[PDB]
Write a structure and sequence with these properties.
It is globular, with a radius of gyration of 7 Å. It is largely without helices or strands. It has no helices and no strands.
């Protein structure tokens, strides 16, 4: 769920719909 916490832990594709992960 937490993907936008810096440094962004948007490693998973489920975090990709989040514009924080751009």
């Amino acid at each position: 769920r937490d993907c936008c916490t810096p440094p962004k832990k948007c490693k998973d594709r489920r975090c990709k719909p989040l514009k924080c992960c751009a």
